[PDB]
Amino acid sequence: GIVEQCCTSICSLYQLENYCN
Amino acid sequence: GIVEQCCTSICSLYQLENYCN
Amino acid sequence: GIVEQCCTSICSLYQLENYCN
Amino acid sequence: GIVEQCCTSICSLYQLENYCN
Amino acid sequence: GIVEQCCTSICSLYQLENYCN
Amino acid sequence: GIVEQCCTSICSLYQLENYCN
Amino acid sequence: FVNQHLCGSHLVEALYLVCGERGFFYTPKT
Amino acid sequence: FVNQHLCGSHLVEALYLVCGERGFFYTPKT
Amino acid sequence: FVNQHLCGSHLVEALYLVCGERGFFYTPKT
Amino acid sequence: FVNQHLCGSHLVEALYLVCGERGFFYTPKT
Amino acid sequence: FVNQHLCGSHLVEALYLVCGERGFFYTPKT
Amino acid sequence: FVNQHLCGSHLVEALYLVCGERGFFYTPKT
Ligand SMILES: [Cu+2]
Ligand SMILES: [Cu+2]
C-alpha cells in the first residue's frame, strides 16, 4: 500500500503523485 | 461540495464521514 | 490519563469528548 | 480572551503561558 | 520573496526548492 | 545538531532560539 | 459533536481523523 | 476499522477538532 | 521571543508547545 | 539526501501538498 | 506538480517536505 | 515539567513558532 511505498519503507515525492486524482 | 462548503461554511464530523473509504 | 485512554492504548472519537468543556 | 486576541491580534509565547496547567 | 508570494500568490514545489540547504 | 540538541535528546524553548535568524 | 471551519490541509487532517484506516477520497470541485 | 494512537501534538489536534468552540482541557499528569 | 498570529488548531499547537505536559485549558469565548 | 517515513497524518499532509487541487485518494487497506 | 497557497506554519511544513534533511532557510522579508 | 523530543516536521513547527518573523535555519546535517 501507500502505507507501504511510503510509511513502512520510504518513497519519492514522485511516488506520492501515483496517488493524485 | 465538501471541500468548498467546510471552508466557506462549517461542517460537522458527521458530514465528513460521507467521504470515507 | 488522556495519554492513557488515548496515546498509550487507543480510544474512540467518543472518548475524546469526555475531555470537552 | 486569549483565543480571540491571538487570532485577531498577535500574542507572545509569554501570554500563552497564562493558560498552562 | 518566497514567504510573501507563496502566501499572497501560489508557488510550486519547484519554487520552494530554491530555498533548500 | 538541532536533531541532537532537540530530537535525539531534549532541549529548552530557549535552545530553539539558538537557531533563529 | 461540533461544527468545524476546515480549509486546506486542516480538512485533509479532519478526514484522516474521521476516516482513519478505512481511508478516504479528497475531491475538490475543479 | 481500528482507531489509532494519538500522541503529543496529534492528540490535542484531535481534541480541538472534536470539541471546537466548547473547548477542552488537556491535562496529561492525569 | 516573537509575537505570533495564532488561529484555530495552530493556537492549540502553540499551547501544547508552551505548556506541554504541565498541560492546558482551551477556552474560547462563547 | 534520503527522504523519510511518512505515517498517518503526516502522510496525508504530504499527499494534499503534492496533489492540491487535483486531490487524492488515501486508501490504507491497500 | 501543483501550485500551492502556503502561509505561516504550512510554508515551513512545505520546506520540510521539499528540502527534508538537506535542510532549509526560512527568511521572511522584514 | 520536562520538555519533549521534537522530530522532523514537529521540530520545524517549533522553530517557526519560536522565531516567527526573524525566521530561522533548519540544517539537520549539522
Ligand atoms: Cu507527528
Ligand atoms: Cu492553518
From Swiss-Prot, chains A, B, C, D, E, F:
All disulfide bonds of the chain are 6-11
Origin, by domain of life? Eukaryota
Under what name is this protein listed? Insulin A chain
The species this protein was found in: Homo sapiens
